[PDB]
Point group: C2
């Protein structure tokens, strides 16, 4: 037992990371087969971002303006193209450590692991959720762009995030691996900011089910609520309204524990209205919303 | 910016994990050079733990009673010995992916990454602290024993923990890689339990320095305290008394930020006495104590 914010093992992604240099800008790229993917902003100087015509900037570049380093080895760039906000550099060598992989675009509320990298080398791994405002709460410094987020299924790496920028509140925005930003964000110097960050209700309920699986049951009660009644309380305290689709995906955990979803909603409603009595659930004095229902099943039963 | 509970990349340790089977017991082992390390309890049946004479149990075993599987491949055991609570199985093949490594024993308050494994295969990675009561807050199920905790320096993996058992409160106990348990715990069915878990004061202060580095400065004030005055407050709220050695290791962060250690103690003292105004530091409504001063420097500057 026990329940922790747990990332996927990073070894499969570590073997994909390379360093990309253009001009005086150095960041990370993702090397899969004979392609290296990286943020298109690598082609900007310091002052190019004011009104960047990425099309004109890339037209002025040739292959030899892109330096790719895999460990100690230079990879020769033999082609380049742009797809949305991502650059694709064709190289003359296929990555011998290419995993089976997919490019996926995730939904708000879903989770993934981040491998933070600098100089094309892995530095740390942590778990993130795509927030309802389409930011992630990352830990990223200068040179981290091109670090990726991913999930693993069996031996298949699903890449879902590439890191591009930091917003004023210290949260982060990026693209899928087709170069399309999550949310309304863009790789330009405009007055962008994260909106209000709503609590992911279905994930809080999933975490309460994790608590029940781990023997924390003090917050359960014998009285049920209605979806409408729960959502009345959810609007205050800044929780996402619970939908029938959200109730649906909590079904497997409800069946496993014997606790009806609307009974868990009644428990959560009591917790919101009356607060936690300095009390811990799974050792935390706060309600956690960065575990999906699938995350809970994986950590409690699936990993075995 | 941003600050997250961040684990080391796990790829170097993933290549060391194997499955060890003895009788009907299956768990994980650590394969380094031509040795596989695993908990000695693998030699017990279900009922052997009541009064286990590990010496007699191991004397009755031969090499062919130990099955080691690395991926799809059986490794042949050619020798066996016991060192404290760890079994060492000599195998006929040296691990081709053996990293440079050290076996280290850590102190309470220090942190490490855990690679949770089942069936000799990696499942997840997360960051832990050795608590003052010599437990860790892990996430471990049946079959996870033999999973290891580690730190990385450059290319050198410092192994510091091997997982053995779970205590009644859902926290965990284990050994260093020489088989010596952390704390008073043993691999026997006795009425063991985690004591009171004190808050790691020096780590909370380190985290407050991380907050200042990240632009959270609202909790700072212009009035200093004394070490004795701070500790008077620290005894209540269940914080470790701050020692001169603890003040010493906060020195580098104090110099970097310009905030004297006793000024940060005054800030922490105010936070404890008056509470946090539903307020966030680094996005958390709780004070975090699972980052060491070295962890903060690594995540804020060192990873670049």
């Amino acid at each position: 037992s026990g329940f922790r914010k747990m990332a996927f093992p990073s070894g499969k992604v570590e073997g994909c990371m390379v360093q990309v240099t253009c001009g005086t800008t150095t960041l990370n790229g993702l090397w899969l087969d004979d392609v290296v993917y990286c943020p298109r902003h690598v082609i900007c100087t310091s002052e190019d971002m004011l009104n960047p015509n990425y099309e004109d900037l890339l037209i002025r570049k040739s292959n030899h303006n892109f330096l790719v380093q895999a460990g100690n080895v230079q990879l020769r760039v033999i082609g380049h193209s742009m797809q949305n906000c991502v650059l694709k550099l064709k190289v003359d060598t296929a990555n011998p450590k290419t995993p089976k992989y997919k490019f996926v675009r995730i939904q708000p509320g879903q989770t993934f692991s981040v491998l933070a990298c600098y100089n094309g080398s892995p530095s740390g791994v942590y778990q993130c959720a795509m927030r309802p405002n389409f930011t992630i709460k990352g830990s990223f410094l200068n040179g981290s762009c091109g670090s990726v987020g991913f999930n693993i299924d069996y031996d298949c790496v699903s890449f879902c995030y590439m890191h591009h920028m930091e917003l004023p509140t210290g949260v982060h925005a990026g693209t899928d691996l087709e170069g399309n930003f999550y949310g309304p964000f863009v790789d330009r110097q405009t007055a962008q900011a994260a909106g209000t960050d709503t609590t992911i209700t279905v994930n809080v309920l999933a975490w309460l089910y994790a608590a029940v699986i781990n023997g924390d049951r003090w917050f359960l009660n014998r009285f049920t609520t209605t979806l409408n009644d729960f959502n009345l309380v959810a609007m205050k305290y800044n929780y996402e309204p619970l939908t029938q689709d959200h109730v649906d995906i909590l079904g497997p955990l409800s069946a496993q524990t014997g606790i009806a979803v609307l009974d868990m909603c009644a428990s959560l409603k009591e917790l919101l209205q009356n607060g936690m009595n300095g009390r811990t659930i799974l050792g935390s004095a706060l309600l956690e919303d960065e575990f999906t229902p699938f995350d809970v099943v994986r950590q409690c039963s699936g990993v075995t």
